[PDB]
Amino acid sequence: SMEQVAMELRLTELTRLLRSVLDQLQDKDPARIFAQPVSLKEVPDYLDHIKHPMDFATMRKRLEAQGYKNLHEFEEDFDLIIDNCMKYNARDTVFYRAAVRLRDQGGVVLRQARREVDSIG
């Protein structure tokens, strides 16, 4: 149908905008602490602690399959990156501190993304 196509164009354009959001958030992680999944070879107990692992590469795979239907789903995954890190790692660690800084800096980017998603519809 034509409606199905229109819907798919909307999803494509959201994917475009979320790709730019993802790039902006990932720049706030210049150490690349959140770039890849936590290695279960190197942290073999990780899944005993963290039930839903997340990282920027995994988000990018979902994004490119057009797997985010709305900004809420995308934000859910970004918050997992931060919150998983803040639980597994102690406050005095470079990992925890990196997550705080990513959360604080990403806030700005996500605030305007929400306005753009609503604005463009």
From Swiss-Prot:
> The cross-link Glycyl lysine isopeptide (Lys-Gly) (interchain with G-Cter in SUMO2): at which residues?
41
Taxonomy, superkingdom = Eukaryota
Q: Where found? A: Nucleus; Chromosome
Expressed, tissue-wise, as follows: Highly expressed in testis.
Report TM segments: none
- Identify the residues that the record assigns to the Bromo domain, covering every copy: 9-113
Describe its function. Scaffold subunit of various histone acetyltransferase (HAT) complexes, such as the MOZ/MORF and HBO1 complexes, that acts as a regulator of hematopoiesis. Plays a key role in HBO1 complex by directing KAT7/HBO1 specificity towards histone H3 'Lys-14' acetylation (H3K14ac), thereby promoting erythroid differentiation.
Per UniProt, subunit arrangement is: Component of some HBO1 complex composed of KAT7/HBO1, MEAF6, ING4 and BRD1/BRPF2. Component of the MOZ/MORF complex composed at least of ING5, KAT6A, KAT6B, MEAF6 and one of BRPF1, BRD1/BRPF2 and BRPF3. Interacts (via PHD-type zinc finger domain) with unmodified histone H3. Interacts (via PWWP domain) with dimethylated and trimethylated 'Lys-79' on histone H3.
What protein name applies here? Bromodomain-containing protein 1
Naturally occurring in which organism (per UniProt): Homo sapiens
Gene (name only) = BRD1
